[PDB]
């Protein structure tokens, strides 16, 4: 919660949360050279109804015993043309570049690991005209982290982003007024060279699940950290837990 | 009155000192320079500006614009005059005369 | 910068300009118990669960010549006389204590000021006592039998 | 053997008092001036709660009068020296008695009872002493007492009631014996076991067995208050019910009742006086409704507590202070005697009971027709045959003994199903 | 309860004449509704208080029925039920909203210190115990006295309970073979 501290208590709080017992979907694609047209289809092009929760695996490649953090880049928008604003979140080995501009997106976009470059060059847009950008910013995360968490939701024209790298609960990253409704998102395929099974046996993971507005019971310890949570409408035991305001 | 024990809300406590904290030399929000601007939008493409972490007052604003009407809702005008807020969102457009 | 409780009230804060952190408590709120005997000029006053330093500094600035501290709290306009006891009482304060009213009558008055309210002990019941022994007086016990009724 | 079991009876409850205007309209003059139009709403609530607390004081005085009435003690009685009679040990039951003690103690049974119950009559005073300062940071009783809700002490201390039960207990042991029917304690035990059908020869032969059975029964009482004792559970349900109702009354200060906020500070810092009143009126109506319902529930529970106090006064007068010829009133049949002890918001009774351990299968007759056409019936016992001779046995302990006039009741005729016995013109 | 017809309950008045002749029929309904809710709430609170008073009165009436049956009309073998012990009998009278009981007790007025035994061991190793009284030793002879009056009288069979053994702390007295 915004600038509040809670200490040794349960709290009944209604926010933008995932449904407990629902399904993640690992949407990270990967290819060494070739790229299929099935990767850019409504199996993988999903809906942005209220927002998404996302759980990202930070892969840690090694070049000359030098650690390189990497994962996939996510793109949110409606029609992905230059008459509409699209949001792009993209990592740069310790720097998260977040832009929201009127891009000229390619038909079959991808990014490329820059340590061990691919056969193809990285090309998700071509914008010679340096387009209008409502937002452009760089944030810094932990390069030695194994999991990163994101909330992306929308409400009354505004877009809200939360993130975490140390721990499971997320903290507030930014907000942005748009005036429009975002309707779709996408996770880009990362055309790398040497990450596969025949190489050093690494994987790309990007788990996405939808969000909705709902009530949770939260547990706060002596450091103000969220230790436990329960979705109040997921089961019968959770009904008893939210009715007693108690985890036992 | 009779003999007995009574529970009385007598004179007990007063507040003596005050505490007043603000953050100093903050800028001005410059609401009037955005309100009194030459380029004026239509109702179809109404515009917004967000003001946060600055100072303002309603006397200078409500005398530096040609005030035709001003009316609050779920608020009161005298309750603004010392308050702080988290942010102020101002939206504007030019009226079609019949509507 | 704010510390809340689960009901939604602010209980502490960290200052922006000094980084000094504080907890907020409400100001003291209570009532006063007044033990009033008929036809007198003022009651005796009990502030429940309060020390008399708190009362004489932070509540009551009108002067009080008779005051003491007690198990129930701060007692004003009364005399500490808890070695005395009484069997009946119509000003009962709680936990075996009472307020008695005794005037400095014209047989034994004092020209200096006094508080006619005393803070005494309340004991409504008793046993009768006898002087006899609890053991055998040579095989037999000592008892008290009535001779007339 | 001799069995022994404990029983809690409730005779009181915590005495709640409520400052109604500081609950409803805590500090704000706008709220107080709006509340003054409901007439005498807070006066009614204060008068109902003062009536309830006056009933509580009357029942506490009735309990103490029942414990103290008629007992005569020796002035030389000193429970540091005298705590034992006839090989039965009473030390864990007595507080302190004498002219050289300082009457501020309980027994160790009462110590074990009052150390598993936090909020007794002394826990409320010591929790309210720590509200100016918190003494850690915060506690629910201080949040209640800053909103006009406070528990008041009873008029008698719990060490006073401990003195009353110590006097009642020691009036059964020492030579006026004002609560053991004027006779010593072990003799009284013998006459009550004889009154169920056990002969006196058995009871004189087994006197030390009876004394050690009493000691064992008391010590098994003493190590029993361990997390599944139903008396401790019944005691703690009183305190838990009070804490639950007071917290539910405090949670009514955070409902909106259809207004824009539950806080009177948030309404009087956002709205003008004509429009703040419409919102304040809804909070006032909700909080008056909640106080009305609380007072109705307190009025219904005072009647249950008065019924329990009358049952306990009857048990003190006819099970502890004397022994009634009512079977199945205290105990369960084969009841011997009771002792009493002070408990949080009530009394603990210790009932002692005769208990068989081994049995025998006997053939018995209920009446004998003797010649002259007379009949005899046995007087709390049966007739048996031993070596083809008729004998008497008591009904609760198998022991043959000769038929006599102290064993039978005579009749100038005999019933139809009385066994024929012309061999009897005996002792 | 009568004084609640003078509360406004947050309306403008407490008189229905002062509302029906001062406001509009679409507008007077709003004020009359507040008066109705207030007076109905007050009536419900009174009815709850009466329904709680009748339970206490019924408990007292059941106890008075018991004292009529068992202290006045007969005498129970209880102790401390009627009166306060040493109780002889009771009479009953009518009183406003109830009954007046008059109890009569035996009251000792002067006392005597005596030395008593609680039972005796006789020859043949028999035991006797006293039947509501004590064994006292007058003129070096064991006699019986009653408990609540001092009058030494002989030992007989209408005076003692018999037992074919004696307790270990019964007083040895072999010189007794009375009636
Ligand atoms: C965010 O960080 C990235 C990478 O650190 C910046 O991108 C670099 O920009 C400079 C100048 O425009 C180029 O010379 C580099 O080649 C870029 N590097 C990469 C990897 O693209 C970017 O400018 C930063 N943006 C902001 C707003 O700070
Ligand atoms: C009125 O609005 C216009 C834009 O509609 C403002 O023009 C901007 O001025 C700033 C500072 O000079 C530039 O950074 C922007 O690029 C300008 N916008 C455009 C579209 O050219 C103008 O400044 C406003 N008027 C005032 C008095 O501030
Ligand atoms: C209300 O805010 C305005 C800011 O627009 C204040 O005006 C400023 O006053 C200081 C004091 O001399 C000047 O240095 C600035 O140049 C003023 N700004 C402008 C735009 O004129 C004004 O003082 C405030 N009103 C009150 C009552 O404090
Ligand atoms: C209270 O602590 C904060 C810690 O951040 C101090 O704020 C920093 O002050 C330095 C001054 O050189 C700035 O460079 C930092 O950017 C500030 N941090 C933030 C987060 O704004 C602050 O000065 C401290 N206050 C006192 C009185 O010591
Ligand atoms: C944390 O909360 C629990 C729950 O009441 C409490 O028992 C514990 O004392 C609290 N911790 C501290 C340090 O007060
Ligand atoms: C790693 O070292 C080799 C030389 O051993 C060098 O050719 C190569 O460029 C180095 N890699 C990077 C990323 O600098
Ligand atoms: C990738 O970019 C370089 C730089 O222009 C170019 O020479 C190369 O041909 C590109 N790769 C492909 C497959 O076209
Ligand atoms: C975050 O970074 C710091 C220093 O860069 C490191 O000590 C810490 O272990 C990191 N935490 C995680 C979860 O990676
Ligand atoms: C990578 O995985 C394959 C799968 O069987 C395995 O054969 C190979 O040894 C692995 N290589 C490394 C470097 O772990
Ligand atoms: C007590 O009352 C009487 C009359 O009610 C009055 O004359 C007298 O002065 C009073 N006593 C005191 C000490 O004021
Ligand atoms: C009480 O008063 C004294 C002197 O006026 C002051 O120093 C002290 O801080 C006060 N304490 C409280 C708790 O108000
Ligand atoms: C009050 O008086 C008693 C004896 O009457 C004494 O022991 C006690 O210390 C006194 N307390 C105070 C605070 O004066
Ligand atoms: C014992 O109680 C009686 C009851 O009236 C009282 O009169 C008497 O003074 C008391 N005695 C002591 C020593 O407290
Ligand atoms: C009563 O006991 C006192 C001891 O304080 C003694 O002096 C006195 O002689 C005793 N009186 C009788 C009649 O035994
Ligand atoms: C009993 O007391 C009465 C009055 O107190 C007296 O007249 C009478 O003589 C007394 N009887 C005896 C036997 O002392
Ligand atoms: C019998 O009397 C002796 C001496 O007074 C005593 O030690 C013993 O405890 C008594 N036993 C019983 C059962 O009364
Ligand atoms: C009250 O405060 C004292 C310290 O002043 C502390 O020792 C005691 O435990 C506290 N009592 C309660 C019930 O919190």
Residue numbers in the entry:
A (entry chain A): 51 to 298
B (entry chain C): 299 to 397
C (entry chain C): 646 to 794
D (entry chain A): 795 to 1221
E (entry chain C): 1043 to 1221
Reported in the publication:
The spike (S) protein of HKU1 plays a crucial role in cell invasion by binding to host receptors, with the transmembrane serine protease TMPRSS2 recently identified as its protein receptor. S1 comprises four domains: N-terminal lectin-like domain (NTD), RBD, subdomain 1 (SD1), and subdomain 2 (SD2). S2 includes the fusion peptide (FP), the heptad repeat regions 1 (HR1), the central helix (CH), the connector domain (CD), the heptad repeat regions 2 (HR2), the transmembrane domain (TM), and the C-tail domain (CT).
To unravel the mechanism underlying the interaction between the S protein of HKU1-B and the host cell receptor TMPRSS2, we elucidated the cryo-EM structures of the HKU1-B S protein incubated with TMPRSS2 in various conformations, including a closed conformation, two 1up conformations (designated as 1up-1 and 1up-2), two 2up conformations (with or without TMPRSS2 bound, referred to as 2up-TMR and 2up-1), and a 3up conformation with TMPRSS2 bound (referred to as 3up-TMR). In the 2up-TMR conformation, two RBDs adopt the “up” position, each bound with a TMPRSS2 molecule, while the remaining RBD of protomer 3 remains in the “down” position. Compared to the 2up-TMR conformation, the 3up-TMR rotates clockwise by 8°, with its RBDs leaning more towards the central axis. Additionally, in the 3up-TMR conformation, the CH bundle shifts outward by 2 Å compared to the 2up-TMR conformation, indicating the efficacy of the receptor binding on the modulation of the S protein conformation and subsequent membrane fusion. Binding of the receptor TMPRSS2 results in more open conformations of the S protein, changing the interaction network in the S protein and triggering a trend towards the post-fusion state, thus facilitating the initiation of the invasion into host cells. The binding of TMPRSS2 induces a clockwise rotation of the S1 subunit and a centripetal compression of the NTD, resulting in the rise of RBDs and reducing the contact area between S1 and S2.
